[PDB]
Amino acid sequence: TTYADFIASGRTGRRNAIHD
Amino acid sequence: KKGSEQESVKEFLAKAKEDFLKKWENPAQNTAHLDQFERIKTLGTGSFGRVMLVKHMETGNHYAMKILDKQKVVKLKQIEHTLNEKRILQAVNFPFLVKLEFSFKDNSNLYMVMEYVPGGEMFSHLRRIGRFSEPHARFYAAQIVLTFEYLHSLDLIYRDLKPENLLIDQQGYIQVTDFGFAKRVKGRTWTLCGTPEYLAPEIILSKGYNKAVDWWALGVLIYEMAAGYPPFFADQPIQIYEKIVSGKVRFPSHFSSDLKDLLRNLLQVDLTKRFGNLKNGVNDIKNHKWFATTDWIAIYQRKVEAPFIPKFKGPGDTSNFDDYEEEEIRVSINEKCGKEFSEF
Ligand SMILES: Cc1cncc2cccc(S(=O)(=O)N3CCCNC[C@@H]3C)c12
Ligand SMILES: Cc1cncc2cccc(S(=O)(=O)N3CCCNC[C@@H]3C)c12
């Protein structure tokens, strides 16, 4: 399932902002 | 349809603008000092510094103090964004925005002292529970709709909507924090900033953009709340960006047909078809079928019982936040970057 794919991914923690 | 309700909103926003402009043109500066505060615990971090729970010694009130290291802000080229953040935050006043109580600076750091919001980040509660029901997600989404109605009326773009930046108060309502990328601009702006999962296609394609980016992000937020995962995810930012520009979204099987219809209109790649950016403005969103049971005025007045109220065991309680490593606050004997932060 898509949710199972998400929780095993590298981005489930707090996400930082990007910038120039 | 224009009616009495729409006229009352217009009058409220006209008076709010007058109030904002008086503070915008004459910003408050240097309204406290570090040694008026006892530092208790770190509640959160970022790239410029940290946020600490503090106690104001003279009143005994608790506050959240954001600390920014001036040299780190210069190194990362965030001088102008930091000036925007403070000047905007001291001027706004709305029930779902965190209140800035004091600001000051010293030889090394910039400090912003805000109201302490004890319920924790929506992010934490969402990852734990998995997903919110449609009625639960709609309650929170309504608060953000009214917030963006207010902010955009003052010529502000917010640019960093995500569950990490929304805190839950004692009554179960939302407070928006982090105004690090907020800007007051008439016309288009061009900076590449925000969070990869939430970026609108016009930002990625370097096209010049306006307030419509905030309405895209609201589409991303609603999806994530109702699904438990964002519509565009991958392990690497560049793979995320590819998905965003393609204009292909898949909805979970359990999304109602009305939610799907709202999200197709918020997640519109083409600017001139995107809800929030058409002739009827915000009213295309407020009048959509998904929001038919929402009493907008009752949400504003905070008279709706929240679906979730976080557990709070007395003032000063931090159990709804994670633990972090405690660092000493260093204050140099020489003044750093004085000219750059003159107006702060
Ligand atoms: C706990 C807290 C509590 N009350 C007010 C706050 C105001 C701003 C930031 C925080 S904070 O959460 O420490 N914060 C910044 C660190 C990065 N994650 C985003 C998040 C909203 C507050
Ligand atoms: C808001 C702002 C506010 N005050 C002074 C400024 C001086 C230069 C640039 C800006 S700025 O617009 O922040 N800026 C730089 C950041 C990247 N985008 C290009 C643009 C010209 C200022």
Distance spanning both ends of chain B, measured CA to CA? 44
Polymer length in residues for chain B: 344
Distance spanning both ends of chain A, measured CA to CA? 35
Nearest to A9 among B195, B228, B235 (CB): B235
Measured distance CA(B147)–CA(B141) in Å, rounded: 10
Q: Which residues pair with B112 in a beta bridge?
A: B66, B103
Q: Would you say the CB of residue B167 lies under 6 angstroms from ligand 1?
A: yes
Measured distance CA(A8)–CA(B189) in Å, rounded: 36
Measured distance CA(B260)–CA(B221) in Å, rounded: 13
Give resolution in angstroms: 1.9
Q: Is A1 on the interface with B (CB under 8 A)?
A: no
Task: Point out residues after which chain A has a gap (C–N over 2.5 Å).
Answer: none
B41, containing H or E segment: strand B37-45
- Compute the half-sphere exposure of residue B208: CA atoms within 13 Å on the CB side of its CA: 4
**Other residues' Cβ atoms within 10 Å of the Cβ of residue B143:** 20
Q: Which of B167, B183, B88, B70 is nearest to B122 (CA)?
A: B167
**Other residues' Cβ atoms within 10 Å of the Cβ of residue B308:** 14
B163 has binding-site annotation? yes
Q: Which of B124, B173, B100 is nearest to B319 (CA)?
A: B124
Kindly report the backbone phi and psi dihedral angles of residue B38, in degrees, each rounded to the nearest multiple of 5, phi listed first. -95, 130
Residues B184/B178, Cβ–Cβ less than 8 Å? no
Q: What Cα–Cα distance (Å) separates residue B276 from each residue in A6, B219, B272, B281?
A: 29, 11, 10, 5
Q: What does the angle CA B50 – CA B214 – CA A15 come to, to the nearest 5 degrees?
A: 35
Tokens, residue B95: 């029930």
Which superfamily is assigned to B9-26+121-311 in CATH?
Answer: Transferase(Phosphotransferase) domain 1 (1.10.510.10)
Experimental method, per PDB record: X-ray
Residue closest via CA to ligand 1's atom 15 equals B44
What stretches of B38-133 show up as alpha helix (H) in DSSP? 70-75, 79-89, 122-129
Could you state, in order of their start, the residue ranges of all structural domains in chain B?
A: 9-26+121-311, 27-120+312-342
Q: What Cα–Cα distance (Å) separates residue B327 from each residue in A14, B73, B188?
A: 21, 18, 40
Q: Which residues pair with B156 in a beta bridge?
A: B184
- Chain B nearest-CA distance from A9, in A, is 6
Measured distance CA(B210)–CA(B102) in Å, rounded: 30
Contacts of B197 in chain A (CB under 8 A): 11, 15
Question: Mind telling me the catalytic residues of B?
Answer: 160
Q: Would you say the CB of residue B6 lies under 6 angstroms from ligand 2?
A: no
Tokens, residue B44: 């959160």
**Other residues' Cβ atoms within 10 Å of the Cβ of residue B41:** 13
CATH class of B27-120+312-342: alpha beta
- Chain B nearest-CA distance from A11, in A, is 6
Residues B228/B131, Cβ–Cβ less than 8 Å? yes
Segment B133-138 long-range contacts (CB within 8 Å, at least 24 positions apart) = B133/B307, B134/B226, B134/B256, B134/B259, B135/B307, B136/B225, B136/B307, B136/B308, B137/B222, B137/B225, B137/B226, B138/B290, B138/B291, B138/B294
